[PDB]
């Protein structure tokens, strides 16, 4: 209205000037961002002291003028100063005032029809309060908690998105008249945009605040923290009130904002598609891509495409890694070897073939790296920091908490490095039927030994026996491991140190591109096999709910 005319007259006055005309005429609009910085540049060394010094003054708050006149806020309610006619030097459109004014405004000022909209603006914090109300606190105890420093997420979030996708969400939920050309995401996920739009349409609100709060709503805060017990976002948000190095506040938090069942379902679906698409020897990869694209799953209310979910997820698991590779998604520097986790701290190497006779004389080639190489490892409730050297396990330091898991970790690690005589002279039991070509595809020696150890405990005991056994010297009794994963013994496995306390997980914010072969062998710009289809559960039957496999 008349305001429009005021804006036009202002623009006219601006163009009548010479300098403003030049800066508007030249270049594009992005210059605005630049201009947004050359102005309002002022900081302060010690903010605390400045604030305390200022607050003593009669009028420490700049404020709007016309809004105060409109609201019939007088200068003095009752012998108490609130503001005085003046102009702030910098803004030139504001008048000094005092803090007392807020109290007056709070107690007798203008009242809006409804303020329940705040519950939508800060849905994260109200969710925090609602979750906290359902925690049954049991009992404080005292003990030396074992804490492992690992990266985690500290905000339960649904439909986690990237910065690029989110930016359109803010524009398409608040500022539609200035929305950019329709993107793929907005077209695909239109139920979410409609749902957000309805709540924040035809409402008196500071739009910028809502946009910033939606940014925080869709950001899972990842932090590198000490941790104990299960790993769930519901706990990490208040871990500070669950336990420290010396105390533990027991509490049952299982049934709040379940976020693990959807991750589990996604991994199960990826396993199912990866196992389906192994039939086509010649064109497994193309079948896999088509299979992924023509599938979807329901998240809460909305239905999302599996391809986008895989890109967003951060599950460093062999199932997801291959699928991310096929789509082209970049992923973390995290290896795998069966149901085990690995992370190369240092070292190098180069492939070197060696023969293994399976039975009598039956040569079978297997490749082994040739250099020193340190490796963090992680099996269930156990961890390690081993090192290899030229087809030999130099040492392994374990810091787990279970005997069975310790033995399994040690065995899979020994296999990883192709140490031991068995690799030179294969066990008598293993045959050529199982060696390779279960479905016409060769299976290298290491995965044969891995299957062997899983098949029977006796094979595992024999493998561990293959590593030399010595007598536990004095003092080192505590740092020793028997065959049953004992804390100490009289005789123990050679060069197998044991300690208490989980080995701290390393960290690296790197992204490596990795391809995959026709046989689903994920190469990563070098020989390493990050993942394969021969490190997944054999098979299992499941009834998936709220999923769409729209493929014949």
């Amino acid at each position: 209205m008349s305001l429009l005319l005021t804006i036009a007259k202002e623009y006219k006055r601006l163009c009548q000037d010479a300098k403003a005309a030049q800066m508007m005429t030249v270049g594009t609009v992005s210059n605005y961002t630049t201009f947004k910085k050359w102005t309002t540049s002022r900081k302060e060394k010690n903010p605390s002291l400045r604030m305390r010094w200022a607050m003593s003054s009669k009028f420490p708050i700049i404020a709007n003028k016309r809004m105060l006149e409109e609201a019939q806020i007088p200068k003095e309610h009752n012998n108490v100063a609130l503001w005085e006619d003046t102009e702030d030097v910098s803004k030139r459109d504001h008048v000094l005032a005092s803090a007392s004014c807020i109290n007056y405004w709070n107690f007798c000022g203008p009242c809006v029809n409804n303020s329940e909209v705040i519950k939508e603006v800060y849905k994260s914090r109200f969710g925090r309060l609602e979750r906290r109300k359902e925690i049954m606190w049991k009992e404080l105890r005292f003990t030396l908690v074992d804490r492992q420093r690992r990266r985690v997420d500290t905000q339960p979030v649904e439909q986690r998105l990237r910065t690029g996708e989110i930016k359109d969400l803010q524009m398409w939920t608040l500022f539609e008249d200035e929305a950019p050309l329709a993107s793929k995401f907005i077209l695909d996920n239109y139920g979410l945009v409609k749902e957000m739009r309805s709540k924040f349409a035809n409402k008196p609100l500071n739009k910028e605040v809502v946009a910033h709060m939606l940014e925080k709503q869709f950001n899972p805060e990842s932090r590198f923290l000490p941790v104990f017990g299960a790993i769930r976002p519901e706990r990490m948000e208040l871990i500070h009130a669950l336990g420290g190095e010396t105390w533990i506040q027991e509490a049952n938090t299982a049934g709040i904002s379940n976020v693990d069942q959807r991750k589990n379902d996604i991994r199960a679906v990826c396993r199912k598609v990866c196992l389906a698409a192994n039939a086509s020897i010649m064109n497994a990869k193309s079948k896999l891509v088509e299979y992924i694209k023509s599938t979807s799953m329901r998240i809460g209310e909305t239905e999302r495409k599996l391809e986008e979910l895989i890109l967003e997820t951060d599950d460093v698991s062999p199932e997801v890694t291959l699928c991310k590779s096929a789509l082209g998604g970049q992923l973390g520097k995290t290896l795998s070897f069966g149901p085990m986790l690995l992370k190369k701290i240092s070292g190098s190497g180069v492939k070197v073939k060696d023969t293994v006779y399976i039975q009598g004389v039956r040569a079978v080639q297997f490749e082994y790296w040739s250099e020193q190489e340190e490796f963090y490892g992680e099996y269930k409730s156990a961890t390690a920091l081993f090192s290899r050297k030229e087809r030999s396990l130099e040492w392994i330091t374990i810091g787990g908490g279970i005997n069975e898991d310790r033995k399994r970790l040690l065995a899979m690690c020994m296999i990883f490095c192709r140490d031991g005589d068995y690799f030179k002279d294969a066990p008598a039991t293993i045959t050529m039927a199982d060696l390779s070509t279960k479905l016409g595809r060769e299976i290298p020696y290491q995965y044969v030994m891995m299957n062997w150890i899983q098949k029977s405990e006796d094979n595992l005991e024999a493998l561990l026996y293959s590593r030399g056994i010595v007598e536990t010297n004095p003092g080192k009794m505590g740092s020793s491991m028997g065959i049953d994963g004992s804390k100490r013994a009289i005789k123990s496995l050679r060069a197998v140190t044991i300690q208490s306390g989980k080995i701290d997980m390393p960290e690296s914010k790197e992204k490596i591109h990795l391809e995959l072969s026709d046989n689903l062998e994920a190469f990563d710009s070098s020989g390493r096999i990050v993942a394969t289809i021969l490190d997944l559960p054999s098979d299992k039957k499941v009834t998936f709910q709220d999923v769409s496999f729209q493929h014949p």
Partner: protein, 698 residues
């Protein structure tokens, strides 16, 4: 009795009480310093070979590959043998892998090219080459782009590469204009003024705007390198370096043989900055950039040479006075030469050797480094030493590893006998002396395993959280009422999670913060008897408040927050109980005060008054330009309500967008809304006239 508080260290662990020593509960606390720095720098370089420049015609002492005066080598030496440095670089490349550095310089080039030239505003105070004063980055950037515009033509560039090529062209220009209450300067004065680096006593350097972007490029590549290395802790912080040290110790205790025995050494290098040379950095950056695109080779090489020709400004000069001290004269650095007689003997003796290097209010220094400039490149250079390994050590069964951050390191030596431990340590000291890196003998100490210190973190079986370091954090920032309390609680939460702060200490600090908050903002509880401004009106209208619980702390509230509710602002916990009148009034977006960070936006989120000292100073000419940009931004935001959050993009200029959007809005509101054809025609005519005027004027 004679009370002694240290006796608790006789029968109690020293780490579990080391926090008691830190006096972090109290307030913490020129030219002579700079001259001493210059003297020590010229002294460390042991050589006497001096060249003569042609550009400046000033003797240029050469601080590399000219070692002489091999007396008392224990002390700091700043001469460098490029051969050894390059050999160490080769050893690191070999260990890391083939072509380790190419991937890094690629990951830097991926950013340097697309980088916008406005990211120089987010930086420490930078010297201005027009007024000759330290100034925030943004104002200096605007000033130099206005000088460019006045000189030859508006800066069409929008990216870093264009900016760097424009600075390089600006070095060639004979004359440079720049706005002032509009002086012109010949090529030599601007050549000197670009390199000049000021100082701030926060000491710390303040490099010119000209150098800044190349410094960013070099720091970017050095960062991309350091992040990969496992023997550094500069980019990382807090937990990460603890985990690094713990994994290193496990590796050590496993690798060493039974005959062998480990040792530790807490080291604190000395004269880090004084002894680092940018010429070795130049050669090193050349070696790193041997296969990568020819583009990075030139760009990286600039900053080392610029630093190798840097001047250093002397500030505030000496002060003269009489006996009674009644009168007092002030004298600047430029005039020191004149009154050489009127100074103490020590000051004269220090000043006289540097007169030849000294230029007006500057001292040309052909080398050396200053604080904060090249932290990560020195970290790389120092990590090089830890890698070193030769046949002799392996023959004797000795090996040293460690973890270095800037000017602070930790060493883990291994051998089979003390006679060999000492020899190993001496070998390390030698290899570090070959590249300037020294070691302090007093602040540095060693011991048998499990007793070291690294960046104020003492280590034993456990790691005693300093707590003192985080004690200043338990203060009201002084932003606004809503922000302060929430930020304090979040700080307590972080200190609880990481520094293992106890629950009762957390509660006590929370209560201390609530009472200091109540005191600063002149608030107090409703039930108290205090009188004053806010409290009086609070009492006046308190009767209306039916539910006391929901009352906000600033508005006569009570504490409803604890250890289990530190991750939730009070405005949220109190929402249900709050009365509807108070609730709606507090959260009514039509607020004069509210200006726009895990916090709720209420009327309390105000902004402070602005300083007024400038009111008297004639710093107003700048205010005009700032006001011009402010107006343009203000009304572009008036039209487009999403200009700040989502960066604008397009091909139209600002004027054209305003023109078309305004016309379209006018048409939409004439179609249905309350506007008349006369009004619509008037608006459109106004727009046409304004456009014509804008185009015609310029």
């Amino acid at each position: 009795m004679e009370i002694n508080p240290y006796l608790m260290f006789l029968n109690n662990d020293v780490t579990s009480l080391i926090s008691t020593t830190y006096p972090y509960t109290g307030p913490p606390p020129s030219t002579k310093y700079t001259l001493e720095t210059i003297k020590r720098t010229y002294d460390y370089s042991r050589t006497s070979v001096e060249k003569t420049s042609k550009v400046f015609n000033i003797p240029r002492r050469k601080f590399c590959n000219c070692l002489e005066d091999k007396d008392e080598l224990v002390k700091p030496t700043g001469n460098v043998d490029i051969s050894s440095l390059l050999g160490l670089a080769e050893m690191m490349e070999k260990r890391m892998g083939e072509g380790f550095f190419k991937h890094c310089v690629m990951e830097a080039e991926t950013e340097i090219l697309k980088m916008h030239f406005s990211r120089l505003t987010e930086g420490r105070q930078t010297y201005d080459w027009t007024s000759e004063r330290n100034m925030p980055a943004a104002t200096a950037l605007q000033l130099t782009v206005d000088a460019i515009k006045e000189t030859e033509g508006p800066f069409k560039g929008t990216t870093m590469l264009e900016y760097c090529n424009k600075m390089i062209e600006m070095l060639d220009w004979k004359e440079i204009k720049f706005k002032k209450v509009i002086d012109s300067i010949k090529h030599d004065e601007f050549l000197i003024r670009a390199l000049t680096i000021n100082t701030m006593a926060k000491a710390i350097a303040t490099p010119g705007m000209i150098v800044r972007p190349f410094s960013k490029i070099v720091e970017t590549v050095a960062q991309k390198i350091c992040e990969k290395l496992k023997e550094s802790g500069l980019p990382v912080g807090g937990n990460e370096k603890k985990a690094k040290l713990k994994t290193t110790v496990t590796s050590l205790n496993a690798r060493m043989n039974s005959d062998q025995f480990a040792v530790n050494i807490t080291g604190d290098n000395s004269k880090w900055n004084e002894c680092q040379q940018p010429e070795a950095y130049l050669a090193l950056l050349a070696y790193i950039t041997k296969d990568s695109s020819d583009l990075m080779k030139d760009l990286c090489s600039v900053a080392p040479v610029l630093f190798c020709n840097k001047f250093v400004k002397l500030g505030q000069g000496i002060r003269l006075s009489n006996k009674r001290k009644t009168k007092e004269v002030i004298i600047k650095a430029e005039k020191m030469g004149k009154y050489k007689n009127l100074m103490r003997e020590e000051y004269k003796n220090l000043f006289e050797p540097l007169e030849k290097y000294i230029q007006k209010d500057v001292c040309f220094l052909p080398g050396g480094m200053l604080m904060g400039m090249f932290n990560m490149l020195s970290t790389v250079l120092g990590v090089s030493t830890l890698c070193y390994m030769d046949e002799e050590l392996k023959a004797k069964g000795c090996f040293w590893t460690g973890l270095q951050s800037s000017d602070d390191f930790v060493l883990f030596a291994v051998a089979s006998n003390w006679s060999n431990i000492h020899w190993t340590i001496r070998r390390f000291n030698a290899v570090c002396k070959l590249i300037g890196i020294n070691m302090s003998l007093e602040k540095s100490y060693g011991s048998l395993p499990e007793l070291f210190e690294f960046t104020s973190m003492f280590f034993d079986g456990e790691f005693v959280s300093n707590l003192a370091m985080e004690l200043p954090a338990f203060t009201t920032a002084g932003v606004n009422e809503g922000v302060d309390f929430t930020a304090a609680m979040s700080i307590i939460k972080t200190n609880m999670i990481n520094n293992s702060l106890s629950p009762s200490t957390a509660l006590m600090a929370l209560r201390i913060c609530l009472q200091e908050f109540r005191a600063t903002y002149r608030v107090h509880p409703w039930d108290s008897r205090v009188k004053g401004g806010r409290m009086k009106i609070i009492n006046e209208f308190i009767k209306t408040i039916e539910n006391k619980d929901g009352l906000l702390i600033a508005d006569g509230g009570k504490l409803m927050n604890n250890i289990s509710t530190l991750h939730i602002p009070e405005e949220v916990l109190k929402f249900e109980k709050m009365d509807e009148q108070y609730r709606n009034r507090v959260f009514n977006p039509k607020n004069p005060f509210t200006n726009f960070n895990e916090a709720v936006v209420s009327t309390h989120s105000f902004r402070t008054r602005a300083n007024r000292t400038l009111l008297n100073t004639d710093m107003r000419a700048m205010m005009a330009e700032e006001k011009r940009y402010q107006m343009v931004c203000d009304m572009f935001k008036s039209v487009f309500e999403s200009a700040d959050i989502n960066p604008p993009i397009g091909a139209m200029s600002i004027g054209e967008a305003i023109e078309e959007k305004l016309l379209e809005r006018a048409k939409m509101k004439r179609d249905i809304g309350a506007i008349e054809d006369s009004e619509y025609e008037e608006i459109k005519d106004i727009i046409r006239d304004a456009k014509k005027a804008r185009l015609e004027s310029r």
